[PDB]
Amino acid sequence: AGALGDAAAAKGRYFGAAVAANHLGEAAYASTLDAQFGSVTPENEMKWDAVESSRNSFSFSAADRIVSHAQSKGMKVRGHTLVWHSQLPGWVSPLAATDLRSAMNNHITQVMTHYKGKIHSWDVVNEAFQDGGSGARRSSPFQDKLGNGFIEEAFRTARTVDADAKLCYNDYNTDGQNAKSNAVYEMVKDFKQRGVPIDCVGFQSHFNSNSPVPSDFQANLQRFADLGVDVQITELDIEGSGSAQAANYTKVVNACLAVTRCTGITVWGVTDKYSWRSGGTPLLFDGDYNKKPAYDAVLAAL
């Protein structure tokens, strides 16, 4: 579906966008989405606090609006995200280990159940590693109380619920080979060696002046692909403007299309207007939904 989505599909990939339910009724937002993209990711609507703010009480309406729209347009859906340290409801962190484990598996199971057979890929675990040089696990209720094994447990639970979804580990600042991506690499290699059910590694790819597109972006994607997983660019945006921004997008698209198991790219929003990094004007469409030089470069590269 869509101009970018169909261009990508011709070479066996998808092209998606992060979507917000609260903008779906806006004519130009919906028109741009439907004209351009072949996959969607709910920006906020499937996060823990959005779907289970009260324990064992699930609120799917907002995410259902995005999924229903996608299905009506023949678009793929990425589920985002099941287990994540960030933006948890207040009551998750005080739970003792045994009850946290139960609550985590219950959350995975009921969320995946509601969307069974409708989800192309799940971000099962998100952002489990620290930034910087340590390669260490990030502190979280899951890491602190369940230990290193919580990631494997989450993937095992996920696999029992919906065998048809690709199960992804997702993270940022993992674009080049560095201490952080090395820690993820070690984990995924170990998972694949032992037959842990992981199908994919997501690379958020939030690029800016301090975190530029690295010279080894392609080689890094390739080494992950070579472990026997798909790689997905999940949250792509690139701060800047004009030819410099366009050339950065070319670099990224070229790298994905050069890696046979890079199965798709999702940009983190439809329009600059609603970007989480709006002052960096980092997307393919401006505030009036007009195609930017960045868009032209992406389309020409596909």
* Interface ranges with Mg ion (CB under 5 A): 302
SS3 251: helix
Nearer to Mg ion among residue 238 and residue 302 (C-beta) = 302
Active-site residue (options: 43, 45, 127, 235)? 235
CB of 300 to Mg ion, least distance (A): 7
Using DSSP's 3-state secondary structure scheme, residue 227 falls into coil
For residues 206 and 212, give the distance between their C-alpha atoms in angstroms, rounded to a whole number.
9
174: helix, coil or strand? coil
Distance, CA of 203 to CA of 102 (rounded, Å): 29
- In this structure, the number of other CB atoms found within 10 A of the CB of residue 102 comes to 12
Beta carbon nearer to Mg ion, 251 or 273: 251
Task: Considering the complex, state which of residue 236 and residue 253 has its C-beta at the smaller distance from Mg ion.
Answer: 253
43 an active-site residue? no
**C-alpha span between 106 and 289 (Å, rounded):** 40
- Which residue has the closest beta carbon to Mg ion? 302
Residue 25's Cβ-count burial label (10 Å; 0-12, 13-18, 19+) is exposed
Q: Does the annotation list 302 as a binding residue?
A: yes
Separation between Cα atoms, residue 1 and residue 205, nearest integer Å? 23
Min separation Cβ 79 and Mg ion, Å: 29
Q: Least distance to Mg ion from the beta carbon of 301, Å?
A: 7
In order of 47, 65, 154, 195, 236, the CA distances from 264 in angstroms are 22, 23, 24, 24, 11
- Minimum distance from CB of 302 to Mg ion (Å)? 5
- One-letter amino acid at 12 equals G
Provide, rounded to whole angstroms, the least separation between the CB of residue 284 and Mg ion. Answer: 16
Choose between 129 and 295: whose C-beta lies nearer to Mg ion.
295
Residue 219 or residue 300: which is nearer to Mg ion going by CB?
300
Q: What are phi and psi of 171, to 5 degrees?
A: -160, 160
- Please list, residue by residue across 129-144, b when 16 or more beta carbons sit within 10 angstroms of its beta carbon and e when fewer do: bbeeeebebbebbbbe
The whole-angstrom separation of Cα 240 and Cα 250 is: 14
Please give the annotated binding residues for Mg(2+), written as ranges: 302
Please give the annotated binding residues, written as ranges: 302
* Residues assigned a catalytic role: 235
